[PDB]
Amino acid sequence: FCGKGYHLMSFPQSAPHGVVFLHVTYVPAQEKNFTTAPAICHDGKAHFPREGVFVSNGTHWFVTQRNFYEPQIITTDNTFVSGNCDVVIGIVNNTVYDPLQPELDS
Amino acid sequence: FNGLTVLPPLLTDEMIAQYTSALLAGTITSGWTFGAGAALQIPFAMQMAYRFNGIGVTQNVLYENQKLIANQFNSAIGKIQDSLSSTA
Numbered sequence: 747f748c749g750k751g752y753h754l755m756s757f758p759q760s761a762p763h764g765v766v767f768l769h770v771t772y773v774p775a776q777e778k779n780f781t782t783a784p785a786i787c788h789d790g791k792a793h794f795p796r797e798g799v800f801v802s803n804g805t806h807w808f809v810t811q812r813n814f815y816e817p818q819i820i821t822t823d824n825t826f827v828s829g830n831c832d833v834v835i836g837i838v839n840n841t842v843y844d845p846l847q848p849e850l851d852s
Numbered sequence: 853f854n855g856l857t858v859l860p861p862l863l864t865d866e867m868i869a870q871y872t873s874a875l876l877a878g879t880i881t882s883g884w885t886f887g888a889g890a891a892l893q894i895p896f897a898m899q900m901a902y903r904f905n906g907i908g909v910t911q912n913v914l915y916e917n918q919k920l921i922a923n924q925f926n927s928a929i930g931k932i933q934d935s936l937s938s939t940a
């Protein structure tokens with residue numbers, strides 16, 4: 747509606763018998779291939795990302811936002827436990843880091 | 853024939869069908885990313901979770917009922933053939 751790309755804001759300009767709009771948009775330029783999976787299995791339960799999608803760089807799996815590549819370690823704070831691993835199709839296996847575990851031990 | 857001229861359109865019949873085919877491939881293989889920028893590949897089984905997340909439905913509903921949603925969608929597409937042919 748405000749030009750090609752993700753709309754951010756726009757600017758008005760006067761014109762003879764009309765108006766001129768300067769639409770500022772967010773358009774990505776570079777991209778990279780990444781192996782994905784809809785969910786992961788930690789201890790038999792299916793973990794789905796609250797915000798984002800699971801990606802893999804060939805050796806480890808990370809979770810990042812859809813529009814930008816910001817890989818983060820998958821934890822229980824970024825994923826919600828729901829269902830079972832049997833009903834999900836294409837599910838993979840990955841260990842979910844728990845931030846509560848090193849605090850109780852230290 | 854007696855002063856009337858019917859000019860042919862700029863785009864032919866097969867020209868319109870090729871444009872819709874490009875949009876159909878972009879919507880299925882890339883979702884809404886091809887409209888904003890370049891074509892970003894994404895699985896269709898995972899693209900539907902993005903659409904459910906935009907209407908207030910969590911992604912666990914899609915994966916737990918993937919076979920029911922796929923069967924419901926295939927039956928809905930097939931009903932258009934009978935609805936258009938019988939009801940002119």
Ligand SMILES: *[C@@H]1O[C@H](CO)[C@@H](O[C@@H]2O[C@H](CO)[C@@H](O)[C@H](O)[C@H]2NC(C)=O)[C@H](O)[C@H]1NC(C)=O
Binds near residue numbers: 803804805806
């Ligand atoms: C995938 O990402 C992980 C996370 O960074 C990489 O693992 C580490 O990568 C650094 C490179 O700066 C190495 O110094 C570490 O030794 C790696 N740690 C482990 C446990 O492997 C991993 O190398 C990346 N894989 C690819 C193929 O890029």
Ligand SMILES: *[C@@H]1O[C@H](CO)[C@@H](O[C@@H]2O[C@H](CO)[C@@H](O)[C@H](O)[C@H]2NC(C)=O)[C@H](O)[C@H]1NC(C)=O
Binds near residue numbers: 787837838839
């Ligand atoms: C994730 O891990 C589970 C178990 O930790 C795997 O389930 C096993 O799969 C093999 C081969 O299909 C069976 O022989 C075992 O009996 C299964 N064990 C259990 C406890 O169910 C599962 O296959 C792993 N996921 C993937 C994608 O390999």
Ligand SMILES: *[C@@H]1O[C@H](CO)[C@@H](O[C@@H]2O[C@H](CO)[C@@H](O)[C@H](O)[C@H]2NC(C)=O)[C@H](O)[C@H]1NC(C)=O
Binds near residue numbers: 920923924
């Ligand atoms: C929710 O509704 C769907 C369809 O509206 C139900 O799926 C059908 O269930 C019947 C009987 O259980 C089967 O014979 C059909 O094959 C199913 N699929 C169709 C019509 O595509 C479903 O059972 C309902 N309930 C739940 C809990 O999902």
Ligand SMILES: *[C@@H]1O[C@H](CO)[C@@H](O)[C@H](O)[C@H]1NC(C)=O
Binds near residue numbers: 777778779
């Ligand atoms: C991703 O892999 C496919 C495999 O053929 C390749 O064609 C494509 O160029 C790759 N993407 C990028 C950004 O290189």
Ligand SMILES: *[C@@H]1O[C@H](CO)[C@@H](O)[C@H](O)[C@H]1NC(C)=O
Binds near residue numbers: 836
């Ligand atoms: C993806 O499709 C290929 C082609 O049939 C199949 O071999 C593979 O198991 C599929 N992977 C998943 C996770 O569904």
